[PDB]
Symmetry: C3
Subunit: 125 residues, 3 copies
């Protein structure tokens, strides 16, 4: 593998007071379910399924701007555009952006980051 592809990374808060969750495991399950829901909805329209690897985390920023002491509970979502599944990388990028905005809405987040990083994918099967 010498050609390049992309990976995305999204950082989202988990809004435990709105969703009535009380643990990292509950937040991961919630984000997993929401992502599965919206990713399937977009797959049905475009044949692009943005699968995601989601990790528990906390995000540390200024207490003045709303951060709890020691950090806000967050989830990181990351995923590669696998060339075996993705014909059109620009259409995949548009789909990730669409889903990131929808995740922001579903999670009731005020702001949200979505990054694209160049990567060289070796796929073992």
């Amino acid at each position: 593998s010498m050609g390049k592809t992309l990976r995305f990374e999204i950082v989202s808060g988990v809004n435990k007071g709105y969703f009535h969750t009380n643990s990292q495991s509950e937040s991961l399950d919630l984000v997993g379910g929401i992502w599965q829901k919206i990713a399937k909805e977009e797959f049905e329209k475009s044949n692009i399924y943005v699968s995601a690897v989601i990790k528990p985390s906390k995000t540390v920023y200024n207490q003045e701007w709303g951060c709890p002491e020691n950090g806000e509970e967050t989830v990181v979502l990351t995923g590669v555009a696998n060339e075996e599944f993705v014909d059109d990388i620009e259409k995949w990028k548009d789909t990730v952006i669409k889903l990131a905005k929808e995740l922001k809405n579903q999670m009731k987040q005020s702001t949200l980051t979505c990054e694209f990083i160049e990567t060289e994918l070796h796929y073992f099967k």
Copy 2:
């Protein structure tokens, strides 16, 4: 040097139907111990030790393709090629690829992603 080098990232499932681990921390230890073993075996042959930073995760894809509701338990392994230890970036890359295939086999996975990403390493010691 400017520290221009590579990092790798692997995403592996944990085969609960095979290992019967009963928590996220047990899955982490299971993958960590396996990685520790195969990394040492390769180091004894090549003097390349691919150390790895491992994170708990859930991977979310279409339930039609076997994904449990809210995602499958996975582990993400990431590591840099530190020029302090690595003379030859291409041999390190070939070592990572060998270990990724070996991990896929030892974890009894049908597919496994292994990505290389360009990175600028600043090493403080």
Copy 3:
């Protein structure tokens, strides 16, 4: 290729801080980062926010690694052009804080990587 992100891998020094779980180690590192980032922001108007993840780092038992890995924390953060006017000064700030983190966590060695990234920010 619009901007940069950093990633730092830190030990948690169980023998010094006496945390009992990965949740406590995460909070310990987070609180330390929150303080040094705030103090640097007052000086330079650059606030290096960080997304921190629990982890274990696996290396050779001959070099001190516990069986199945050492408990670690990964810190990662982007330079958001809406906040950051000077990417080189942000980079210098990240390095400054990473060294200060290494000191406060009583670590012997620490990695700090920079990766090119294209940031889309939704508000």
